[PDB]
Amino acid sequence: GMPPSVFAEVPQAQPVLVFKLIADFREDPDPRKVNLGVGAYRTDDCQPWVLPVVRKVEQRIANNSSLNHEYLPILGLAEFRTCASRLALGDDSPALQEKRVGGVQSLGGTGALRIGAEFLARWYNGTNNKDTPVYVSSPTWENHNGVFTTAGFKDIRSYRYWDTEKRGLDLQGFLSDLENAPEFSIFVLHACAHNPTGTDPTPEQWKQIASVMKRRFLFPFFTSAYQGFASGNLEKDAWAIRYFVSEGFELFCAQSFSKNFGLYNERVGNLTVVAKEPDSILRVLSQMQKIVRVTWSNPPAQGARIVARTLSDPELFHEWTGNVKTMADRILSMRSELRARLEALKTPGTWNHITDQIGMFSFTGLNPKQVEYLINQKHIYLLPSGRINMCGLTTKNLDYVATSIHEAVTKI
Amino acid sequence: GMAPPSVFAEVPQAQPVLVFKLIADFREDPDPRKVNLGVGAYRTDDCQPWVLPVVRKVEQRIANNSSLNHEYLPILGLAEFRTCASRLALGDDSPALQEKRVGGVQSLGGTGALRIGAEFLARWYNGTNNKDTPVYVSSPTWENHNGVFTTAGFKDIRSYRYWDTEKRGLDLQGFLSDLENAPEFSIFVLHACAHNPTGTDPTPEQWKQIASVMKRRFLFPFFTSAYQGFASGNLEKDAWAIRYFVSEGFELFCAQSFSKNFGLYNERVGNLTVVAKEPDSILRVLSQMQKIVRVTWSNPPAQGARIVARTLSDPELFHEWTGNVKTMADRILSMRSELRARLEALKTPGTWNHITDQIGMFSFTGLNPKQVEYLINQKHIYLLPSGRINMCGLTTKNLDYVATSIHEAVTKIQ
Secondary structure (H helix, E strand, C coil): CCCCCCCCCCCCCCCCHHHHHHHHHHHCCCCCCEECCCCCCCCCCCCCCCCHHHHHHHHHHHCCCCCCCCCCCCCCCHHHHHHHHHHHHCCCCHHHHCCCEEEEEEEHHHHHHHHHHHHHHHHCCCCCCCCCCEEEEECCCCHHHHHHHHCCCCCEEEEECEECCCCEECHHHHHHHHHCCCCCCEEEEECCCCCCCCCCCCHHHHHHHHHHHHHCCCEEEEEECCCCCCCCCHHHHCHHHHHHHHCCCCEEEEEECCCCCCCHHHCEEEEEEECCCHHHHHHHHHHHHHHHHCCCCCCCCHHHHHHHHHHHCHHHHHHHHHHHHHHHHHHHHHHHHHHHHHHHCCCCCCCCHHHHCCCCEEECCCCHHHHHHHHHCCCEECCCCCEEEHHHCCCCCHHHHHHHHHHHHHCC | CCCCCCCCCCCCCCCCCHHHHHHHHHHHCCCCCCEECCCCCCCCCCCCCCCCHHHHHHHHHHHCCCCCCCCCCCCCCCHHHHHHHHHHHHCCCCHHHHCCCEEEEEEEHHHHHHHHHHHHHHHHCCCCCCCCCCEEEEECCCHHHHHHHHHCCCCCEEEEECEECCCCEECHHHHHHHHHCCCCCCEEEEECCCCCCCCCCCCHHHHHHHHHHHHHHCCEEEEEECCCCCCCCCHHHHCHHHHHHHHCCCCEEEEEECCCCCCCHHHCEEEEEEECCCHHHHHHHHHHHHHHHHCCCCCCCCHHHHHHHHHHHCHHHHHHHHHHHHHHHHHHHHHHHHHHHHHHHCCCCCCCCHHHHCCCCEEECCCCHHHHHHHHHHHCEECCCCCEEEHHHCCCCCHHHHHHHHHHHHHHCC
16 A cells, blocks of 8 residues: 555456457458448449438538538527438428427437426426336337437336347337336337337337327337438438327427438437427427536537538528438348348248348347357458448349348258 | 327526627628627637637647547546647646646636536535535626526535725735635635636735635635736736635645637636645545546546647747747736726726736726717627726727717716
8 A cells, every 4th residue: 555546446348249250350360251230322333322301511611711600509500400310200280380389409310309307207298207108119229228228217128129030020018017006107109110120110000109108198108210211201200209299299309410411420410399389398398408508518510511401502401301311222222132142042931021121220130149150251341230331232242132131041 | 199298398498698699680780880799708809719820730630630539538637638738727846746746637728627616625525425514706707607506506605705896906905805605615716817707806905805715714826827828928927816825725626728818719728736644645635536437427538638738748839838828818918908098098987907907808888888888889899798898809990989988988977
């Protein structure tokens, strides 16, 4: 002994698995390597893609010397908030016409989820009620648990969702978990392109889900991270949110522009709030301002400026919808091709889930022991859950992946 | 029959944050003599925002570089930004940098850096999940300091004496007494330079006395550094206190903002610098910071951090930036000197050396609330009830009117 560090007992936090997987993919010398663990759009040449419309808008911003760097309002750039909420709800939304919608610019979809969770933990179902159950899908994006736990919720639960046998939605289990949820429980719902499985309810299934939630006063907290990106069409991909609005729900929707604009690193999100009346929006927003203030003070400008300009200009909007469909069509192509080649190899089991699923992520139905084969033997990198990113498939590796998967079903 | 009440029906309306209505009232005022001394950011002599020339230049270079992509940054942020930011605060020759016992977390402005640090301390400092460690802020401080530490879960927020109303300066004896009486391990939120809102800073000799009590009572320094370079034009002088604490062997946090010294307010550029006793703890601390960031904003934005990293890493841009910072610092120094000279030429009662002894864009003038009300209502000069002014609200054109009006308030009111 000779003063002790105030950090002497701080533990090393747990190694998250996906980041070491992409690291292990990079260490691999094998020239057959394929990374199906990526979590962002990639071209047929395995490259990131800045959207043409984004490049165009970035040039217009750079050429506009009148733009300053003064703080945005706490709740964000007004034109961005309006355009983002209109994108989710539709231009002609009655909720917008009736002035009962609010929008809070946020730091990606994550920031929107966090602001909403903080609000609910303080002002929903009582004051400072940390006991309201929060239900997330089984499985879901793992940061869902972390966000709601950090907001103080003590009772995080899951609803049945992925059926490992049918390779699809366990609707009966989901409905039963809704029926058994205490009234006023919060449900975190993927608006489309469920992450990580890719399996979405059909509109008819959504109507059954909404019916139970309406009867039991369950709160819909939608996450919309893939609007337009998922199917190629922004209107189709927002239908479930808009259906809940038309059924009279009050709800939150955490929107991300990370994927559909490719603006991952500019942290562009929006929390849309739908209430019964305009006065409630004013009071809710006043509390969300306090929450934002003590978290990031006010939000950054560059990404929200890009989105606002694109969505406000019909010519740019049309160009953007084309760029979005290009991404969705490449994914739809990889799904169609993978299924066709797996069926051409006569691979055991059914494979229609590969094309029934929606978005960039797919639960393939492979088991962990089959996963380790693809990694160790064939250098195809994917998660133990069997999740793949379809953007890791290309015209050049599709045959290798499909044959390796066929070997990974018949031999292992 | 009756529609159910909204699930939001009992949510109260929050009450506004004071200065926003003041600015709104200024904007609606028809009088051509009106002056906004309540502004919270740098303004030119023509009352305008100023994008720094070096920032415009780097933005053009970024826009012309098609190789840059938009893929997620690491959770902790852009590596070159974090290294450059911590080196700016600590100095290239810092013993802590040489010994590899420094971490840096890119954050959403200085506010985000304060919040990440507060969340970490509320989980891992002075025990596990100890929400009872006292957190001390200056009397007065930026009110969002209290809100950040309260939201991180600290239940015992206290203040240390700081502004002396009678002397128009630092209450050193009160500050030292509050340090001496603070429970061991209490956290002190310290303004590294250009105290906000008063402009009153300890001298180096006073900082040595403050540090001596903190060392002896094991009090944790959580510095804010929002005005480095902006305050004096001299980056080393403006970081002297942080560097002195490092030299004295403290572990500390430093929440840095680039909102003011780069004028990058709306790009939300900050960095939390961590100084630890031993290099091996930095990896452990940063691993916990990663978890905190992940559930807050996931990962930080690129644009502003790229601008700062490019400027600080290139000799030619760095030199241009230091000149741009000096331009801002010198304008504020000029407004302070000119205001003091006019108040003394008018033989205004009281002492006015605090107008030039204070540092940075904010000044506690010493005017009382009734005098402030006179300035707003009678003279259309807008400032806060505390008597805080922003020196950037003064201009060559308005200085005579502002000084004359202050002289009127002092002699006629109260």
